[PDB]
Every structure is written in C-alpha cells, then in structure tokens.
Symmetry: D2
Subunit: 464 residues, 4 copies
C-alpha cells in the first residue's frame, strides 16, 4: 500500500464500501454534470436526515475535484443513507433528500434548481370506450420496456402510445422537456420455462445524439402522418420478407433448404453419367514437372461413373430437364435479388422518415450510461460518462476510472454482446450549454481548505 492512491491528471474514483457500486455510478453521473456539481458545491443550508447527507455529499465532491489521491472513501455519505433503512429504494431516498435540501434553501427565500433540471411535462390525450380525456402530467425519468425493440426510438414510441388511437386509446406528447433527460431501460420479463422474472438479453441500440422532435406536442399532426406511412411500409415489408423466406427455406417436409440449391443439385443429379448397377453389387521434391499452359487444370479428377446417378436417361429427357431447371434457376436467382433490393429500399425509407431538417431541431447528447450485470436484486453497476471538455468517453468502475471509447460502451450497454446492459441513459440538451459551466481561465474549488488538508495528510508517506 505504498504510493498507490495517487492521481495522474485523471478523475477520482470511489471506494466500494461493501456493495455500493450503485452509489458510485449514480454519484459520478451527477458529479460529471457541472451545473449540478456547482449547485452541490455552492450549497449553504437554511424534516429528515437529508441536510447532514447534503453536507457529507459536499465533502465527497470537494475531495473529488481537489483530488490529490486516486480514490475517495464514500463511507460517511453512504452510512447516513444506509441508516434510514433494494438499490432503487436507496437511489430514490438519495434524490428525495437532495431535492428536499434544495427545497429548504429555496423556501427560505419558488424554483427548485435540481427539480428544474430533471423534471418535465408531457400531455396525455385519449379516449376511454368513447369518452375523451386530456391531462398534462409532470414526469422525471421516462421509463421504457425493452422486450422486442431494436432501438430507443422503437422503445419510446411504443411507450408514448397505449391501445388504439382515432374504442379506447392514449397518446403522450412532450410539452416541456427537462435539460437533463433520463430513460429507464427495463429488461425484466417473467420467464415461463424458468418460472421466475429474468433480464432479457436482446440488443437495444441508442444514439450518441437523440432528436426528440417527433415526440414533441407541436409536431403531433406531422408525426401522426409519418407514423401511418411507416405502418403501411412495415406492412409491405412483411409480405416481401414472407415471400423471400419461401425462396430461402423451400420444402414441405421438416427440413427446408434454399430453392436455388434444390434446382442446382437436382440438375447436377440429372446431368451425372448414368450407372445401371446397384451400389451393393460389388517430401516429393524429387519430381521433373512439365510446363503448365495457361487456363488449364492439373489436379482435375477422373470422369468415371459413380453413385449416386440416374440408372438411365433419354437425350430428350436430359434436354427437357436442362432447359427447365436452368431457366427456373435464373428466375429464382433474379426474384431473390429483386425481393432483397425492395426490402432494403423499404428499410432505408423507414430509416430516413424523420431525417428532414424540420425534425432535427431538438438534439439531446448522451452524457452518461449506467450499466448493470448479474442477478436482478444483486449484480454490479458501473458507468460510462462523457468528459465534454476532453471530448472522450470514460469508464467509471469503483476506484477504477479509465479512458474508454464508444465501442467499449456499446459492447457493455446494448445487450447480447456481454452479460451487461445499460439500465439507464442520461441525455443532455445540446442547446443547454449551462449544464457544462467550467470556471474561466482569462481545481480551485468553491470549498473552504478541506481538500488542502486531506492532500497534506496523504503527502505523509513513511520511509523505513
């Protein structure tokens, strides 16, 4: 334990204090959100054990910006939180206390600067057996179910639509968006074979920049139309995928093979030299090689009749077969190509449905990804957080803070690639330049001489 807890111009880690990986992830995520870091740092207090937790969190983020060491011990902050008693219940109370802390600071003087960052509003419009309704709900983290979806947009759309819109239905439309937009990616589904709920492992993609234009209430008439076009296109896309499958998995029996091979090999059989008998009736570097003329074949096998082959065939029989099976093969080959072109064409059309400039004006940039691996009410959490000034992805895994990549993030967060997959996505408004508010140069924390002491106490290294 000599000269091990020392920095090298890298972000500070956090101690595990048992199984508090969930704490590291949530905290490091918040801390890397500069405006929130400033709100916690420049916090002065004016119900619960909320205010000592806020005060202990100050000492956590102070020694995390003052660094000096490699990792900080979050023991005092975690102990207050643990004394109040799954990890979600813990995360919930944590946020409760922080919101309540900022509420007391505001109430004394109302806008809650923390609630101003994470919470937004959406409009819920629908019908219940013919009777209309319209409500504007406040939301925080928008929760998503990931079973059977290919990406985040597929996911989100399915969540902002309930029933059948026109009969009972409901549509959600964002009215007010939070500058810090968060999504839950719920992978828990009941496994009948296992007889318990388990995490689903299908790959669900998400972009580095998400355009929330289509989900906006103002774009409600436009999106509804684009949506119906995709309904029709997906319908067409199916019929083609069905027909193409009949070409690729041909046959009426239990085993199907491609039709093109069925025809090729059938013709191979017919064109084989007939056999009238039953198959049961029965360091050379010392050689003077000849010159090989171009376009020839040397190891070409002998042409003698062997089984399996027709017993007999007519010249007319062969000529009929040869003309049939060859023309039909070209027909089959051309149709598979034609079907595949059309499928990709429909796919491209769907992909670029919301690509026009009037649907690209609400950009949200991915700031953090919270990953989980393992059993449901167990496992381990780590995070991928973006270092906006350095323009680089970072892997925050208790004590270990390493320079990562988008490629690393995807393997660990999309699912299927590894036993780990993202449980939460944190997006930041690209227009919201105030969430990354670094101190001018035209380190020296808002704190009062605390990190200066823990950097001197650690400077004390004995030498025998």
């Amino acid at each position: 334990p000599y000269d091990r807890k020392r920095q090298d111009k890298a972000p500070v880690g956090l101690k595990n204090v048992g199984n508090t990986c969930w704490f590291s992830a949530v905290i490091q995520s918040l801390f890397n959100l500069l405006e929130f870091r400033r709100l916690v740092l420049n916090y002065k207090p004016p119900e619960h054990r909320n205010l000592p937790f806020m005060r202990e969190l100050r000492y956590l983020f102070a020694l995390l910006v003052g660094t000096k060491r490699k990792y900080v011990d979050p023991s005092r902050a975690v102990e207050i939180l643990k004394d109040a008693f799954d990890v979600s219940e813990f995360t919930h109370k944590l946020l409760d206390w922080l919101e309540d802390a900022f509420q007391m600071k505001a109430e004394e003087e109302p806008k809650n600067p923390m609630v101003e960052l994470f919470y937004g509003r959406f409009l819920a419009v629908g019908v219940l057996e013919g009777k209309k309704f319209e409500n504007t709900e406040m939301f925080g983290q928008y929760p998503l179910q990931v079973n059977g979806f290919k990406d985040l947009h597929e996911c989100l759309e399915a969540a902002m639509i309930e029933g059948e819109i026109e009969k009972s239905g409901q549509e959600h439309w964002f009215t007010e968006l939070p500058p810090v937009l968060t999504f839950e990616l719920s992978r828990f589904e009941f496994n009948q074979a296992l007889g318990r709920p388990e995490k689903i492992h299908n790959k669900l993609e998400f972009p580095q920049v998400l355009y929330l234009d289509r989900y906006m209430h103002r774009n409600r008439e436009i999106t509804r139309i684009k949506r119906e076009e995709i309904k029709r296109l997906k319908d067409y896309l199916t019929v083609l995928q069905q027909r193409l499958e009949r070409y690729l998995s041909y046959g009426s029996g239990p085993k199907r093979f491609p039709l093109v091979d069925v025809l090729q090999y059938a013709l191979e059989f017919a064109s084989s030299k007939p056999v009238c008998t039953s198959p049961v009736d029965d360091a050379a570097i010392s050689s003077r090689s000849v010159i090989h003329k171009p376009f020839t074949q040397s190891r070409i096998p002998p042409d003698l009749p062997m089984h399996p082959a027709p017993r007999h065939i007519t010249e007319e029989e062969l000529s009929v077969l040869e003309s049939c099976l060859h023309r039909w093969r070209t027909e089959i080959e051309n149709d598979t190509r034609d079907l595949q072109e059309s499928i990709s064409r429909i796919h491209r059309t769907i992909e670029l449905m919301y690509s026009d400039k009037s649907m690209i004006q609400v950009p949200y940039r991915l700031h953090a990804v919270l990953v989980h691996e393992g059993q449901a009410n167990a496992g381990h959490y780590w995070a991928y957080i973006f270092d906006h000034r350095e323009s680089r992805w970072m892997k925050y895994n208790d004590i270990a803070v390493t320079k990562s990549s988008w490629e690393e993030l995807v393997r660990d967060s999309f699912g299927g690639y590894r036993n780990a997959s993202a449980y939460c996505l944190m997006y930041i408004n690209d227009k919201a330049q105030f969430l990354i508010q670094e101190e001018f140069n035209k380190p020296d924390l808002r704190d009062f001489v605390e990190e200066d002491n823990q950097r001197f106490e650690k400077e004390l290294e004995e030498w025998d």
Copy 2:
C-alpha cells in the same frame, strides 16, 4: 454430530483426510477382493517403513469388517505413506510396501501370494527390419490408450499389435493370466488448440464379462485369421459408408442436403401452379358445426398460385419431369435402404466374429471400476465395486457407500455422458472362485478384540 456415524447393514466408508479420495478407491477395491482381505487380515510379520504401514492397514480393514460406525478415519495409514514424500507415485509406493511385506513373510519360510494375484505373463514375438525376436515379459496392469477406440476389445487389440506383422512388427499374446486382471484406460492426449495435455472425452465401452480367449497365445493361429477377416470386412464397410454418405450429403457446394429431398422438392417446384408475374409487382364455442364425412379434410388450405413457382411449363415438360424425378427418387430410396442393410449386416458379422463356443472359455467378470473427474494432477476419484454375495453394484465415494446400478456405472465410467470416466478396470477370473472366499455358516474377524473397543468407545453418546 449426534448418532450420525452409525451403520445399517451397509459397507463402511472412509474419511477424506484432505484429498485422499484416491486412497479410498484403491483400498476399498482391494478390501472388496475377499482373498486379499484374508491375506491382509491373517498377516503376521517376520528395509523401509513398509511393515508399520501393513500393520496400520490391518487396523483399517479390521474396523472396516467390524464396522459399528458409518465411516473409518484412514489418517494413521495415510500419514505413514505421506511421510515417505502425484497420486500414482503414492499408489505405487503403497503396493511396493504391501508386496515387500508379503515378501518378508514368504522369504522367512518362494511364492508371494499378492504377486500371485495381480501379475501375469505375455509373449512378445516380432521382427526388427527383418531380424526376428521372441520374449516372455512379466506384466501387472496392462496399460491401454483410449484415443479413437469404441470399446475395450478395440483398445486391447491395438495394444497387442505394434507396426506391421508378417518390415518391422510385434504381437503380444497372453501366456499366463493373473486371477486379478487390471487395465489402465489412459485418456491423456496433447491438445494442440489448448497447447497442453488434456483428458479425451470419447465414449469407450467395456463389458460386465470379458472373454480373453482371442488374446491367448494358444489361439494365436485362429485369432490371426479372424483378425484378417475383420480387416477385409472393415475395408468393405468403408466403401459402403462412403457411397451412403454421398446419398445423405448430396451437392457440390458448401451446403449439402439429402439427395431424396433434392429430388422431392425439385418435383414439388415443377408440379406447382405457374405464376407469370414477379414477386415485387404488388372462445368460438358458439358455432353450429356440420357432419364431417370420413376420409375428408376440414382445415385444407386454398389452392391459389403463389411464389415460388415456375413462370411457365409445358404439359410435355411436366410429364418428362414427373417421370424422371419420381423413378429416380424410388431408385435413390431403394439404394439408401440397400446400403444401410449391408452396413448393419457387416457390423453384425464383425460383432459375432469371436462369438463361437471355442472363443468363450476364458471369462473375466468385472469386480471394480476406478473413476476420475476433473483436472489431470487434481480432480477426484471414486469407485464402483460389485458386492458378489448380494449380486449388486455399489458406489464407494469417501464416507458415502450407496447401492448403485450398472446404469449408474456406465454414465460415470464410459465417458462423454458426464465429466467423469473410468481410469482403471479390475476384472476377476470367473473360474477363480477363491477370490470370493466368505467364512462358512454351517463379521467375527481374524482380528484380536480391536473393533470391539472402537464399537464400545462409539457406543458412548452423551445426553444432556
């Protein structure tokens, strides 16, 4: 630990004393060989630490026949053996000491009763580049390599033949067989992909009764002939298996399918209703059911043309195809059946090669099977030993001695079925009735009042 170490008319187990499972297996195997049990029990001594080990082994088998408890602690016997220093080196020294103990007892008065049980003689006859040789070697455990063999006879034959007999060659022939015949089944082979030696997991079968007649020197002229017949038969067997494979894996491309399906499905295609257009041009328990006439179909699908199908066909084209592909399919179907009959016929001929009464007069009955599971110089050993008086297989696994079956033995010893496979087979001569020498009735050990004390000391059970 109350009333747990108590018997119920079952054999006694042995404590693990660390990782001494190998000791339990080898000992329990010897102990269940009644004549050897008698030799160790009625042992009186007249170089090494061999004689105290023999004396400690007496106290082991005494408390193992006197039972009283569930399992015995082999700590004192194992400690002498361990003080002399892989498990084979340990097993070797163990046997060394026992042989030396019996040698001293004999030498004082020469036949070694232990060496008289396990060791035999075979004749080694051969040629070395034209020059003949003939040696009669003494053997103990005959070691076998199991890579690429289906059963014990395949295994043994490959070991009693080296090179090319008539050039250099060698043949082994048993001259003197030990009443207690043991085989090593070596599964260690260098894995190139892994870069180290590892146990091979192919299934290698062995019988409950093995006839050693063919390997006998007296039957050398006869066996040599039978052997050449099998060479010719296996040769024929190959050519057929090759031709049959051409029927079952038809095609010239990377993906092969059965020829019969290639013809069936090709005809299915031809007989489909032609389509001139391209595939891109585009709780009901309230019903009054009608009577269904016999031999009819209700859910029968509509007969409308669909892709894939010929664009066009001639009535003459179809008639040619229909006659070709149908007759050739029958031809193919009949040939696969013909080939399969012949293959099974050759297989049966090979199976019954050494079945005649003159090759069934040297029976050896399986008495014990020593199983291993896990890493090479690690893992764990247990044994399957036959209880000849009860006529039942028993699983001897440290402390745990359970009534097993042949079915259990096979799953654990043949390989492939489980991660465990037999490393050793102990066979006993069926004519040798003296290896199962039970005391007359027309328990009361040869020992002097020892088990009577450990049965009284254990009777001491406190009750608070």
Copy 3:
C-alpha cells in the same frame, strides 16, 4: 410396361389401382372402404331401385364393377378411369366454390349414401357404419346449453400434442363446466362426451397451421403417436363423472409437474447472461480454477517396445503438474480451505437436487400415464384398420394408405399400382410425423366387439361372390392378351 406379364397379378396379394392423373387420393379412400369387408359386401350385393342426382346411381354401378375386379381379377392393378370420370364430371362447371380432394371425397360418399338411401325404399347400412352421436354440454358467459350432435369423422388438431389421447382430450374439452350456475357464472366452457359410437370410427389429424414467417398455411411436423388399439372408455358420457375426477387429478399433478420442471431448468440452465450452463459445471470448474497452482505473471511475453511392469491402479501417461495460465495470481491456504469446503458441499447439494427433481418428475409422469389403466377404463376397445398418409404441398402432394389384412394378420402398403406387405414399423415412420416428410391425415378404427365388419361369409367363402361375372369376361380378355404377346 407394354408387356402384359408386367401387369399380371402374382396370386396371394391384393389388386392395385391405376393413378389416372393425380387420383392417389381416390386409391387410398377406395382401398380403405374395399378392405372393410361388410361395406365390400354392401357395394357388391347392391341392386338399385325398381322404378327410378343423375350421377349417383351410375357412379354406384361403376364402383360395383371396380370392387368386383379388386376381388377376383387376374391383373396386377385395375383402371379406375370410368368411376373417376363420373366423379370428375360433377365439377366440370367453371363457376364452382373450390375443388380440393376433400370436396371430391365428400361427393363420392354423398352419392354412395344416396344410392343406399334409395334402396332402403328405414336403416341406411352405410350411415349405420360411419356416423355416431356425442353430447355437447357447456356455458356461454354463464348461460347453459346441452346438444346431442350427430358426427361422422371426428376432426382433431395435431398442434403440439404428443399422442392421440392428448389430441382427442383437447378437442372434447373447452374451459370449465359444473353442476351449479354460480360455479359457472361469468365463464365459457364446453365438454364433448360420446353417447353413440360408430362401429367404423374415423379421425382427421389436421396439421395445417398458418406460418407467419412464410406467410401461408403449412403442415406442422411434430411427432404424434397413435395406438394399434384405442380405448374410448374415458370419453364415454357414462364414464363422465369418473373421467371428470381423474381429469381434475391430472390437473393437480400437471400443476406440480410444472413447478418441478421450472426448478430443474434453473439447475440445468444456470446464469444471468445470454449463455447459460449447468450449475454443477459452474461450481466444478470454479473449484478447478481455485485449486490450480497460482501464477503471479501475466500471460504476455510480446515482440517393438520392452515395457516395464505397471503396478495395478496406477497411471502412466499422467501429464506434468506445472503452473500454467489461467490460474489465480495468488491465494491463501485459508482462502483455498474455505473455497474447497463451500464449492464441494454445494456441488453435492446441487447434484442431489437434480437427481431428486428428475425422480419426482418421472414419478408424476408415470402416475399420469397409468391414470386410465384400471379394469373399468379398458372395456371400449377400437382396433386400427387403416391409416391414410399424405406427403408434400397442401392441395398437392400424394396420398397412400396402410391397411390391415385381418385374416392373414399383416399390415399392407397400398400405393396405387403397388400393394406391398408392410409392417407396423413401416407405418410409424410414414405416419407419426417428423421421421419422414409424410404423416397420417386420417385414422380408421374398428370396434373390436364388431366382428362381422371384417369377418368372411360362412360356407369360409372368398371365391367370386356376385352373379355378374363380368370379371370372368375381363380375365378371359387378359388371358388372350398374354397369348397375343407371346405369339407376336
């Protein structure tokens, strides 16, 4: 082919039928009927009404001829062209509904029933053999109903059923039924119970299910077994109360059977990631890793035979025990002792539980299979007489049949011109499904108490039995046909 000795009946074998342009379905249905002796006698001893559809009576006559050849012709197979032509002419109309082989089979039977109906002027001897009655008792959102329906062929959906009893039960049950209205309120269910059984009992085995991936209906290829003798006791209305309680007991047992199969699966497919492995191997291999000799370094560095005597129970080719990767970098003696005790005891626990679960599952399975095995549930035996097989596309393919020769106690394969001596083993490969591209579409069972159905007429008579010996004329023709060939 053209040579008449090729089409000469080798005596002691049944007569085949020509294909006449995809009429394999006709061969199967006809040969099935023909091999049902009582029906063969009804068609043979048929005389039409005194003073008399314009197609049913000529078809019956043409089929009288067909049947007459099948008994005593000297030829190998026989040409069903004139019988098929009358039947095919009924669909010569372009503005029809849909013309599949079932529509053809239906009309065929229509005409035969109508022919026997006209003769009955009353009992219709055909309708007496094939049709029965079942009772349909149920609820429709609380409201009760009770109907006794006449049936012919009882149609079954093959689905994912393992056998005929599984298949039949699923078809005779729907929801839940009870004595009292409250015990039924806000529920829909239905139960079928046989009241009258036909001596000739037929089942349709429907394998057509819409394939979403392919976008069309396709035959399902799962294996569905059927016995040589079927006991219809449990499906009897009189056995209703006993079957209800046994049905309820199996409900309870299957419930238990699930929970076990679920727990066992958690042992066999352990893990939280996408790839699951058996728990026992997870523990074994974890311990293998811990017990490996530690390696403190990283696995990266870049840029004739005279054999000695072998003592029993030893190992010769045993590999060297030197440290290699992968291994722990370091471990404590106490760490290893904890791991060794944990992972070993837990492995035994896991091994014992998998064995315990598997015993219990088989035990429940045996209990379920012997539910209807007692003496009071084996008094309605129906013996399998015929199996109609199909292979290939829907609306296409080919049909053939497996029919039992009751007198010589042997299964026979009826495939058009070709009538070959088969086996039960052959029948199963071709009819159960999965084994081959072919599977039975229809099963014909005969009441074991209904002897007469397949018994010969007393003297035992098997010689030409009808007065119109047109068969002698046809045999005389073929005999002179053989002569002409040798005399060329």
Copy 4:
C-alpha cells in the same frame, strides 16, 4: 429465340459466344484471350507460312474468323461451332488417355503456339507473353541441387490458405535451405524464386482434395482472397536475401502468435469435462450462486394509465428478492466474504488477461500484414485482368469469366451468350469461395509496366482492323435476316 431482333447486338457492349453443347469452358478461355488486346492483334494480323499437325493451321484460321466477329459483328452473340468442331475432332479416337476440358484447353494453346512457330520461319510472340522462368534451389537429404525451370501457369493448392500470398508462398517453399552444407545435412527442402516473369501471369487455384468421408475427390469451399493488384517483389530471386530474413522474422512472430492463441483459448474454453465455457462466466455465475439468499429446504414438494413520477436513475419493474432454488443451503458471513473477495479479484485478473492477450494477438497480426509494405517491396505490380470461375461437379459444372474492360475501367461478366456489366463486389461473391457454390479456378494478371498488352493501336483505332471484311458479309446477312422477319 427464333426472332432475329432477340440476337441483335445492343451497341457499346461486347459480343457473346453460343454454348454449342457444354462449351462454356471454351467461351471463358477464348473471351479471356480476346480481351488481351496484343494477343487479339496477333491472331487478327496472322498470315500462315508460304509453303505448307493437319488441324492446327485450320483451327488458327477458324479462330481468326471467330475473333473478327467478336470485334465488329452486329449480332448479340456468335456461333463458335466451326472452331470447336476442329478441336473436338482431335479426340474422336476411342483409344485416348482421358478427355477433360484441360486436355482440350491444352491442345487449343498447343495449336496456336505451333501456328505462330511456323510463322516465325526466332521469337514466338505467344510464348513471349505467357511463359517465364523461376529458380529452384534445394537439398535432397543433404545433397544440393539448382535448376532454372521454364513455367507457364504457376499452379497453386488452395488448402486452408486465407489469401493468394499465403497460397503462393506455400508453393514456393518446402523445408529449409542454407548457404553451408552442415546447416543442410540430413534435411530436404526447396525454394522457388522468380527470375523471368511473363507479362501475362496466370495462376491455377486447385480446390480438389480427396474427401475420405465421401470416398472421392471434391472441391474445397474455404474463402481464398486475391487482390486487384499483386506485388510480386518478395518472390523475386533478386529480393531473395531480404525475403529470407523477413520470412524468418514472420516465423518468429507466428511462433509467438501461437503460444498466445493457445493461452487465450484456455480462458475462452475453460473446463475439464466434454463441454467447456468461458472462465469469466464460470467465476461470475459461481459468485452469483454464492451471493444468492440461502434455502435450507429441498426443491421437492411431491404427490390509459395515470403514472406516478419516476426519480432519475431508479428501476420500476425490478423483481422481488425472495429466496428460490438453486441456492446454497447455508453459508457463513466469513465464507461469503472470502468467496466475494476471491471470485471478484480473480474475475478482474481473467478479464484483464483476455484483453491483454487479444491486444497482443492483433498487434502481432498487424506486424505480419505490414511485413512487405515498405517502398522496396512494391516495385513489381501485376494488375488483375481476368478471373475464370467454375461451379458444380468435377468433370462437369459450368465455367464463366470476369474480365476487365481497361478502356472503360469496368468489370464484365462473360457467361456464354450473356455479356453483362458487373462489379468487383460481384466478382468476389462468385470467385473467393464460401459465399456461393462457385469459386475461381484461374487468375490472369498483367504487368502494370506492360502497357502495350491492353493499349489500342494509335491513329485511337477501334473500327474493323483486318483486310478480310467477311464481317461485312455476315452483317449484310443479319441485316437481311432482320428484314425477312418484319416482311413475313
């Protein structure tokens, strides 16, 4: 088909060749030669000897006609019947050795070489284009030898080689060679080095290997890549000493590369039993088991929406944490703490080692791929001109070709009557193997320094270039052929 507008050449595209009864091999070899401009000029400007095999000179003349149509005919494809008939007549003898398409191709080229040989009376302009020389230096059980062999097509065995360079190197190396006799004693080896390269360089890609399971020779279907430009610098005799040292360096690197691939495999396929799993999962899942809430009992008992606000970073559908099987029966707090510390630290160790191994393997792979990438190893470029593809049975199947149109800088698919504008992407799917049932059997490369080979004659002339305008006569015929059809 019969209509002459069907067989009308749509101008700006090359002319095809009729199939004449399985002569696809002829089309491929001919179209390949024809698209080699200098050779096209040699055949076109051919005049036979003044005073003069009885089959070679008529074949050359018949091929002169064939080539003349291919340049300026108005028809879509052309009938090679008269040229093929002379060639086929040379094998009309029943008592021959063996007649495969290679024997035919060989005779074809024989006759052409012999034709040009007679004209040379000396340089044979054909032999000057296709044949080269390599040096064969080696030992035969210690005894040295040195031969300079003339070669034409250099034959390659595809085996399990990944690309053409792997393929070629394996063919130009055998054992080990050295300067001193002692360093060679009791060894056999051989090295080939190109001394003279032909401007038209051809390779055979032999995929025929005896299949033991099938009991006959069969084409191998592994993917073997080849570049659009090949640098033959390393195989040059002058580059011998540099290549030797680089060859030796790759030997050392491949050695290292193995040890790593072996160790990595032990991590990815961990276990002692028949089924191996990744070590990382073995540790993860073992820890999952240990951390599960213990269960002391056996797993056997026998016989619109108004949503609430969700706080960020929380989980809603999170399942209940209640004890279930499989789990430890019991565990100690100390037992768990030992396991948790072990299995977690070892997992990080395992994860870091797999990453470390994979980095090093890719690093060695990159080093090997850039071995011959420097400026002194890229001065002998050969550009791919043609690819001859085969599909199907050996001694059967069908041949077609991919030939490059150097003036319009585009790949073309020559398949008999059909000459279509292709791509490199098309070529790869059909020639690399594995992608389709077809794979290239021959590669034709042209020296990039040898411009003339595929350059047009200066004025740029592309109009009929030979005095015998029999082509005008044939065009006149076809034009009146079109007229006759419209006038019927």
